[PDB]
Design a protein around this ligand. Structure first.
Ligand SMILES: N=C(N)N[C@@H](CCC(=O)O)C(=O)O
Ligand SMILES: [Zn+2]
Length: 450
C-alpha cells in the first residue's frame, strides 16, 4: 500500500510531499520526498513517527483518579500503594483483559503506537499459579492484538517485600515467582509473543523486590537478546532504605554490581545524584520518565537537563495511566525543569534549539530502544507506525516544521492527533477506533463490578 504526506518528519528532518510504500507486512519499503501522490492515500495533516510508551501497568487505568482522596495529612506513594493492592486483589483474568484492551485503544488515540507492559500480575486470587502460569501474560498479548498496538511484554520478577530479601506480603501474592519459575515463564512466552508479532523483555520489579543473587542468576541465563527493565530510585524512601541496606544509593548500587548498558531501561531514576546521572549517560541506558505518574505520586523531578547534556537517552511512559497523552508527558517533562530552575527553554540540544523537536526526537529514540522494537523513525526497514496530525487545525496549518511541534506539544493537545497507523494498519481514523464501542461497553461493566 502507499500513503502520501504533504509534510512528514523523516530521520533527516522535515520533508515535503513524501510518498511512502508499505509492505504487506507493515514495514516501510520506500520513502520518497518531493514525490507525486499518484495512487497513494493522501493524508490529512503532518505525519510523525508514532510515540513508544515505554512503561505501563495496564490494570491501574481502572483506578485512575480514584486515589485523589486525602486519608491522612501526609498521604504518599505508600498509602496509594495499599489502595492499588486492594484493586489488584479483586481483578479476574477477564477484567484484566478488558481493562488492557480499553487502555490500549485510548493509548492509540493519543498517539502512542507501541507499549512496554511492565507486567507483574501473574497468579490467581489465592496467589496460586494458573494451570498455564502464563494465563494473564497471554491475555495482555491478546488485548494488544485486539487494539492493534505494538507490544513489548515485560513479565516481572517479583519475589520480596523489601531490601535484604524480606518475605513477600499477602498483598503481593499474585506477583511472586522465584528465579526458576520466572525463567520458565519468560522462555515459554517467546513462542506465543513471536506468533503475535510482539516482543519480550526481562524485568526486575525493583531492588526492593528481588535480591542481588536473583539479578545475577537471571542475567546469566542467556536471554541476551532482551531489553532489561527495572523501577529504580523513584522515591526518597527507597534511597534511604537502600543506603541502610548496602551503604549505597539505588542507582549507585546497580551500577557498582551490574553491567548496565544500552539494553536497560531504568524506570523513573528520579533520585539520581550528579555521579549517578553521569553513570547513566555513559552507559547508554534509557531513563524511563513517567511524568504525569511521578507528579501524581509526588516522586520528584528528574535531573533531565544535566542528563541530556551528557548524552543521556530517555523515553516516556504512562505508568499508572492517570494520563494518556504524549503531549502532557513531553510538555510537563520540560515544564518540571522550568519550575525547578525558574528558567525557560531547558531541554534542547547544541544542534537543536527547538524544544518540542528536542523532546520528540529524544523520546522516539529512547522509546524504541527501551522496547527493543524497530520503531521510532520513518526509515526503510522500520515498522510503519505513525500519526497524522490535524491539517485543518489553524495553529498547525499556519506552522511549518519544528514550529508545528511546538504548537502541538506546548499550545495544543491530544485531539490534534487524528489518524494513527501501527504495522501498516490504520487503527485510529478521524479520532475513532473501530473497536471503541464494544470495548467501552465491556469496560464500563467491569468498572461497575469493581
Ligand atoms: N512505583 C510505582 N509508581 N508503581 C509500582 C507501585 C508498587 C511498588 O513500587 O512497590 C507498581 O505498579 O508496581
Ligand atoms: Zn511502574
Amino acid at each position: 500500500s502507499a500513503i502520501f504526506a504533504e509534510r512528514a518528519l523523516l530521520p533527516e528532518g522535515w520533508a515535503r510531499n513524501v510518498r511512502f510504500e508499505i509492505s504487506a507486512d507493515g514495514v516501510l519499503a520506500e520513502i520518497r520526498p518531493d514525490a507525486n501522490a499518484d495512487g497513494a492515500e493522501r493524508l490529512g495533516g503532518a505525519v510523525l513517527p508514532g510515540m513508544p510508551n515505554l512503561h505501563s501497568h495496564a490494570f491501574q487505568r481502572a483506578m485512575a483518579g480514584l486515589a485523589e482522596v486525602a486519608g491522612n495529612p501526609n498521604d504518599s506513594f505508600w498509602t496509594w500503594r495499599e489502595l492499588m493492592y486492594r484493586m489488584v486483589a479483586r481483578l479476574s483474568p477477564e477484567q484484566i483483559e478488558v481493562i488492557a484492551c480499553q487502555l490500549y485503544i485510548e493509548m492509540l488515540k493519543a498517539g502512542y503506537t507501541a507499549v512496554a507492559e511492565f507486567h507483574y500480575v501473574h497468579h490467581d486470587l489465592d496467589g496460586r499459579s494458573y494451570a498455564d502460569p502464563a494465563e494473564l501474560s497471554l491475555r495482555i498479548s491478546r488485548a494488544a492484538s485486539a487494539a492493534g498496538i505494538g507490544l513489548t511484554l515485560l513479565p516481572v520478577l517479583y519475589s520480596h517485600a523489601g531490601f535484604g530479601g524480606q518475605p513477600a506480603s499477602e498483598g503481593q501474592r499474585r506477583f511472586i515467582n522465584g528465579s526458576e519459575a520466572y525463567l520458565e515463564l519468560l522462555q515459554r512466552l517467546r513462542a506465543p509473543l513471536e506468533a503475535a508479532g510482539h516482543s519480550l523483555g526481562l524485568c526486575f520489579h525493583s531492588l526492593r523486590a528481588v535480591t542481588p543473587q536473583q539479578i545475577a542468576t537471571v542475567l546469566a541465563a542467556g536471554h541476551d537478546d532482551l531489553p532489561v527493565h527495572i523501577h529504580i530510585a523513584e522515591q526518597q524512601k527507597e534511597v534511604d532504605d537502600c543506603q541502610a541496606w548496602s551503604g549505597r544509593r539505588p542507582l549507585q548500587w546497580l551500577y557498582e554490581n551490574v553491567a548496565v548498558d544500552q539494553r536497560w531501561c531504568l524506570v523513573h531514576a528520579t533520585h539520581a545524584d550528579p555521579a549517578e546521572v553521569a553513570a547513566m549517560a555513559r552507559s547508554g541506558a534509557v531513563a524511563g520518565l513517567c511524568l504525569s505518574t511521578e507528579a501524581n505520586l509526588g516522586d520528584g523531578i528528574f535531573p533531565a537537563t544535566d542528563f541530556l547534556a551528557q548524552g543521556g537517552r530517555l523515553g516516556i511512559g504512562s505508568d499508572s495511566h492517570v494520563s494518556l497523552s504524549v503531549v502532557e508527558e513531553l510538555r510537563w517533562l520540560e515544564y518540571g525543569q522550568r519550575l525547578r530552575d525558574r528558567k525557560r527553554n531547558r531541554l534542547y540540544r547544541d544542534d537543536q534549539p527547538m524544544i518540542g523537536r528536542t523532546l520528540y526526537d529524544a523520546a522516539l529514540a529512547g522509546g524504541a530502544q527501551a522496547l527493543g522494537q524497530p520503531i521510532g523513525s520513518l526509515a526503510v526497514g522500520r515498522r510503519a507506525d505513525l500519526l497524522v496530525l490535524d491539517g485543518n487545525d489553524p495553529y498547525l496549518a499556519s506552522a511549518e516544521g519544528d514550529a508545528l511541534l511546538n504548537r502541538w506539544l506546548f499550545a495544543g493537545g491530544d485531539r490534534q492527533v487524528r489518524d494513527v497507523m501501527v504495522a501498516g494498519r490504520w487503527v485510529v481514523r478521524d479520532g475513532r477506533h473501530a473497536g471503541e464501542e464494544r470495548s467501552a461497553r465491556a469496560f464500563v461493566q467491569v468498572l461497575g463490578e469493581l
